[PDB]
């Protein structure tokens, strides 16, 4: 069966961590398992490998210290792990198998940062009254001042179909921040209900926050 590794993972710098990789109650102790670093927008770094029969590890030089590999012949699982890490160690890692083949795992994201669970600062966005001269005027919810991903946005809930371009988080100052935007006719918002259901599964807020002009 195709590989499995757990949810997402988060860290305080200069600390350690146990990352899983489970497989079948067979095919297990026979297959050469690797691990790979990818740091968003990074290429690919082969860290060491490890064998499940023997349990022989083989780290890549430039990690030998930081990283270590191991296995549990029983639990049909192979836990690679890492200690003392940087906002820079912060990346996504996957184990995998296969001769000529590959068939990877869904990978796992890891986050090296210093704050904790901030509910977001949620501001809305209206133009300098048709200062953007268009027959269809543009609109946005800003979600600044936060740190535990992920943040979700829906405009007047999942009511909105298209021209609903949502942006990726730009973490900075150890704080996630991202900005979405919708577009609609000078028929629509001028005089219509447009909330945006900004949301968080850390803080658990549905900061459902409406929008009109006039500042």
């Amino acid at each position: 069966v195709q590989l499995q590794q757990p949810g997402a993972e988060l860290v305080k710098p200069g600390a350690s961590v146990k990352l899983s990789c489970k497989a079948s109650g067979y095919t297990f102790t026979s297959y050469w398992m690797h691990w790979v670093k990818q740091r968003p927008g990074q290429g690919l770094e082969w860290i060491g490998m490890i064998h499940p029969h023997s349990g022989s590890t083989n780290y890549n030089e430039k990690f030998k210290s930081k990283a270590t590999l191991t296995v549990d012949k029983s639990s049909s699982t192979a836990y690679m792990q890492l200690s003392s890490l940087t906002s820079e160690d912060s990346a996504v890692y996957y184990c995998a198998r296969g001769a000529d083949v590959a068939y990877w795992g869904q990978g796992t994201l890891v986050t090296v940062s210093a704050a904790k669970t901030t509910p977001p600062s949620v501001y809305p966005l209206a133009p300098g009254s048709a200062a953007q001269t268009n027959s269809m005027v543009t609109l946005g919810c800003l979600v600044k001042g936060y740190f535990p991903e992920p943040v979700t946005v829906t405009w007047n809930s999942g009511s909105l179909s298209s021209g609903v371009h949502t942006f990726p988080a730009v973490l900075q100052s150890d704080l996630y921040t991202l900005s979405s935007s919708v577009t609609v006719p000078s028929s629509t918002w001028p005089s219509e209900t447009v909330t945006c259901n900004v949301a968080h599964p850390a803080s658990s807020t549905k900061v459902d926050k409406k929008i009109v002009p006039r500042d």
Binding site: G43, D100, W104, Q106, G128, Q132, T177, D215
Partner: protein, 211 residues
Amino acid sequence: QIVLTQSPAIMSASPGEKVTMTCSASSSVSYMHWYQQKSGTSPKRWIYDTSKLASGVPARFSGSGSGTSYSLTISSMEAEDAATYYCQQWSSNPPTFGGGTKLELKRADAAPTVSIFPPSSEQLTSGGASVVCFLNNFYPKDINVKWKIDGSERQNGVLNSWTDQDSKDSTYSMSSTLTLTKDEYERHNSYTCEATHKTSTSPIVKSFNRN
């Protein structure tokens, strides 16, 4: 040991057209491999043993691979073929992964609608105040986004983000920001932003002066 390298880092290509990228090594190398990520989710088993294709690969593909410099070649291009690709290397003692070629569709040059949105009510009860340009559905990629507080071409303080290849809209969009306090913003006036596109090397911009 043995570093691999992708030919064009990025690459725009319309459908139909044949295209080819390349890996090119620090060594004589036996087989050669290639994988295809599609943003966010881990790469797929794509090309192995220099020209052997993983099942489920469309045949549009072809693994050339000469001792030390190797190509990857697409015959006719489809939409699916939109993605991003790398080259493996079984045969170094520590196995290495290629640069990363990125593919995208050539589209009809489209300009961008550029929305700018002065700082909200709340932000002012919070001082550190901020302003967004929202430049949407445009192509191609080239974009000299820049702001200009009081015509002064502001270098720092900027936060850019950019979606890719609007699966539907087939084009990009890029919400950049900008920040200070109440203060040193009370400061400068003419709080405006300009981008520069491939089509309209006659530059287009949305400005602001309020009060």
